[PDB]
């Protein structure tokens, strides 16, 4: 057998690791399938995409078109349906009718061999009619056949009967396909909506306590959930909820010795009170956890738990499974590091003595939390554990529970970040916090919305407990507003860490991205009621952004994104589309100074002609404008961080 | 099982059609194997390439290096040996010694756990010594172990004993490799030197006749071979040598009706005198063909025959195999076309009624000519026959006779041209004749010498009987000189069609690339002796170019090519290297005006420091210059078309 088939169909995309891992989508998401399709000689080709669902049933007729003339690159948009493992194939074929029509349109007016030409047409159309399933379509084609063969009609009339719009519509749906050749099937993994789209809020339950009991419980933290749901969040991400070690517990501001009252770091998991399958006693019991999960569910909030495969020196694993750790020649275990960061309060796990034991235990733990309603896991530092370990763990969990979503917190080099997404992580943290200039945002979002979208789903956290960017430090509230608009409108998934709304921006020291008095090392009570009363919170903006996202399908997808030129370096403009919904955003990246700019819209990318003027509504203010190809904007920090406009 | 192994090794290149077809090389040719290699955590990785020969035997130790810092892209140069089907694998591994050294160089001066660190080193070096085959290398490592453990030496001295150049040399050859993980093997097809490197000369034997018999024979045409060999050619390409049809024979200058004396076109193959396995009676017999092949061989010339799968209406196939043709409804067969070109003198072949019969007959024909010493075929218009047909034919022929070279004359779109090379064509015609400006040449050669070199070998014909470019038409002799220098120095395979040496450049009409009074349609006697005597031939330049190529290995490869900036649009500069051989070419593309320029050499690409000044010899003149990073050149049409320099 030959590698190339009768009609060449080559380099089908998307493809991930040469077909060894699936391309990704979620239910209702569109993307392009493409291929290089051509044939020998000068006659025309056609192509179509066959999508097969998890039961092997083919999807609808999906013809492709040549994407640019003379390139031989063909494409079609497909839309993912129900969740599961699908496949896609490109079918390529000679299109003899298109070729015959091209020649007949020339030869018939010229009087060149008109009887042969028309009989040749008649034979193609009768072959077309024989493959057509519907009676009325067949009759339409056969009437064209009879007209083509009718020697009593003028040549031009015989030809015209074969080129009618009604004949065209039949042949667009059921073309005559010669020498049909298929690509080898490629896999598509279709996952639930939340894998791509959702707003996330991170907070520490222990910080939501009372004057009588400063250490919050699941019951006290549950009373924070209504405010989180009212800001329009969908997912609450909790730091580790397990007992915390005492040996080498860290003190406040990342100091090495805890005092007697110090709470330690939740990531220093494990004590004689229990490990990763247990609840910190000060948070309450598993029954209290269940209450928290249930109250979250009532308010439209899913819980994401941190899963950090590491432990404190007091974790039961340390003496039960010594082979899960690297021991130095004196028998001791070195503390974990992620240079220049040091984690003196924990041991890292070693994987090569007992990989099977570790995987078995990992999936036991995850299934325990899954049985208590946790269907999302934020996986801590996955890039410091083996790639194939995650591949195995995720395949095991998703094999019985395909709805479970894993988020990779891998702030590392591009090859590792991409590979983790490709081996099964549904979502990835990103470089978003370090992309702040127009050039940085433009380049990075062009990457994320391009080929990477076949395997990676970005979660844009504007801050985390480990990342307070200088932009926020120096820009104050106007900068928090800008980064919220950007995160919420550039990615279908975004998030914030509690305190972002209050514009907390005091760093540990100059040149650090750590918070002063970080919540990782201490209880951090916040007077939410006071901040709301005093108007010192951007919760209203956050709430509005989430409402805009919920009302505009364009903001609930990733791949359709276009940057429009402006004449100011500090002003960025972009549009997103989904069906008839178009959102147009203009952001002033300068948190200190008012910017005036001309935004020049690429009108064809909005589906409009260059001369058109179309109404927009800025959803942040309710103000309506009329914008054409060139529009003045004025954006003032503290009043108008951005325009977030719908086309009406 | 998991897709990713213990140490990730991904996206191995080169790759062709995702590993379904081989990457290519020839004996003695170097190229780069690369991969993306990294691991979890912060410890170091290593990698190496394992090349396996046709008997499965591994090549030498071939360590890779990271190609640019922080990219995780690793590479090594490999060199192809004997012809056949090879494979290559990338092996990736943890490099614990490099990691330990990095930590020890920090921790030992700091006084941080120095006894543990040194003992840990001792145990690694012991493990390294256990895998080392040479006794002297083992003793070197074990002496380092004993020094590491020697508590009577200062800490810094214990460490330094493990970092000596002699220890380094052992570990460069036999590193301690943890967790060795392999890519899946990729195929490499290694072919003979001539597939990549050779100078080609096309001529029509029938034009080399005598006053007594104007239609040349193989015996008269053989007397042209000494001049061809003396110009330094390696391959003589003959147009079709078979009987020529009478029905619809073309007249002179592509007219539709032949007169009584008209010879017709050699591509109109076949008559009752025979088909593709026969000799035109006016050329003589098969015994005369054998004489011509034998005389060619004595002069170091291989014959390439045209193979054109098509025929005249008088070919025996027409009535013997009607199913090898497309018949219209009245039973007639339409003449072949390649729009806007019409081939009224031939029928094209149809492939879908009897593909097996056609393949069987095609390989019969090729094997016939192979039995008469023809080991190279110039395949006419392969892109008008099915791609999979050629894939099958070439695999059949190369299965018994892997030395046979097929050249694809496919002037068509890029997808088809690439695919034909990928399915088995050893060489390809190219866009060379339509790349004449500095920008065109630079861009096109960057493509050919880059990734395309894994599957395509270009044959740069400066002219053909179908292509007299306007550049040559308007530029005259100075333009013929420029295009010869370019073709001969940019590709390891180049060629000319007879008459190029005489600067024949009269077109059929303005705006055509056809020759006036084309040799395709008429006998074309040339007075070779006169042109040489009158100095109106560029044969001496052609001869010199071929001698330079034969003396400079840099010109017998494709992939190593670098363009150097000049400050004039009409002056192009490039270098090629192979081992210690470096050739530096500067060409004036203006055939009308003298150009003065500053050529600014990228000195690192010549393997030199920026401040160096190195002697060169212009091999066209024998003149010696001293060139550094910025050099004045003056190039005058009719005197100095170019400098073709060797570094001394
Ligand atoms: O002469 C009348 C005109 O003179 C005046 O203007 C010219 C300047 O004097 C001259 O310097 C040059 O200007 C440069 C300028 O210096 C440079 O900074 C730059 O400027 C540009 C800016 O960088 C840019 O930012 C922007 O602003 O634009 C600026 C303008 O372009 O580039 C200018 C242009 O240079 C380029 O074009 C010119 C013109 O086409 C071209 O030739 C002229 O300059 C060269 C070098 O300066 C002169 O050559 C002299 O030096 C060489 C080197 O020694 C002498 O050559 C002798 O030795 C060599 C051996 O090395 C020998 O050659 C043999 O070997 C070589 C291989 O090595 C073979 O290739 C040869 O075949 C072989 O023979 C040679 O035989 C021997 O003679 C030479 O004799 C000296 O004369 C030329 O004479 C100039 O014509 C230049 O190379 C190119 O780089 O150009 C100005 C003209 O535009 C007046 O202002 C003007 O009005 C007068 O009409
Ligand atoms: O569309 C949404 C928009 O709606 C509301 O805006 C109102 C606005 O309140 C109202 O006043 C009016 O806008 C007028 C404006 O009043 C008027 O002054 C004039 O604006 C010019 C402006 O005063 C002047 O400083 C300058 O501004 C900048 C340019 O816009 C910008 O393109 C840039 O140009 C720099 C140079 O670049 C090259 O070198 C070039 O060769 C050279 O020619 C350029 O000068 O920088 C300028 C200064 O830094 O030019 C302005 C002209 O456009 O005209 C405005 C247009 O009507 O109406 C709008 C409603 O459309 C709402 O208040 C606002 O917040 C919201 O954004
Ligand atoms: O006798 C036939 C023909 O021979 C000679 O043509 C040769 C060209 O001179 C030479 O460059 C090469 O052409 C290739 C080309 O290099 C390659 O890129 C591809 O061209 C594609 C374009 O890539 C594609 O964009 C599209 O071009 C558009 C263009 O973008 C648009 O702006 C506008 O100008 O219309 C164009 C046409 O749709 O399509 C072309 C393909 O149609 O393929 C080319 C080969 O087809 O090789 C040619 C010979 O094969 C003579 O120069 C020419 O006069 C003769 O007609
Ligand atoms: O907590 C650690 C770290 O966090 C923050 O860094 C983040 C960066 O701000 C952010 O941009 C991102 O960095 C990525 C980077 O985007 C990505 O391209 C890759 O970087 C490679 C380069 O591609 C590669 O060329 C090479 O860089 C060379 C450079 O070309 C050369 O000119 C010269 O400057 O040396 C450089 C270093 O060799 O290597 C780097 C890899 O080191 O990967 C980066 C990630 O490693 O994400 C960072 C967090 O993951 C803080 O900003 C930083 O201060 C903290 O130390
Ligand atoms: O208790 C261990 C360390 O916890 C934190 O570091 C976390 C980080 O907050 C989290 O985002 C990431 O996923 O994991 C690391 C490692 O656990 C503190 O920042 C450290 O100071 C603690 O040592
Ligand atoms: O006799 C058929 C045609 O032959 C020539 O065309 C050749 C061309 O010269 C050759 O390089 C290519 O490989 O094949 C074509 C087609 O045979 C003449 O140029 C045509 O006029 C003839 O009709």
Residue numbers in the entry:
A (entry chain B), B (entry chain A): 15 to 662
Task: Reproduce, without paraphrasing, sentences from the article in which this PDB structure was first reported.
It is the third and defining enzyme of the four-step GlgE pathway that is responsible for the biosynthesis of a branched α-glucan. The key contribution that GlgE makes is to preferentially extend A chains, limiting the opportunity for GlgB to introduce a second branch into B and C chains. The enzyme consists of five domains, four of which are typical of the α-amylase family.
To prevent GlgE from catalyzing such reactions, a D394A GlgE variant that lacks the nucleophilic side chain was generated. This GlgE variant was co-crystallized with a preparation of maltodextrin, which contains a wide range of both linear and α-1,6 branched oligosaccharides according to mass spectrometry and NMR spectroscopy. However, a linear malto-oligosaccharide was observed bound to the cyclodextrin binding site for the first time. Five sugar residues were resolved, four of which occupied very similar positions to those observed with β-cyclodextrin such that they interacted with Trp-448 and Arg-449. Similarly, another oligosaccharide was observed in the structure of the D394A GlgE variant obtained with maltodextrin. Again, five glucose residues of an α-1,4-linked malto-oligosaccharide were wrapped around the side chain of Tyr-646 with the reducing end glucose residue being flipped relative to the others. In one copy of the GlgE subunit within the crystal, an additional four sugar residues were present that made no direct contact with this subunit but instead interacted with a subunit from a neighboring GlgE homodimer in the crystal lattice. Therefore, the protein-bound pentasaccharide constitutes an A chain emanating from a tetrasaccharide C chain.
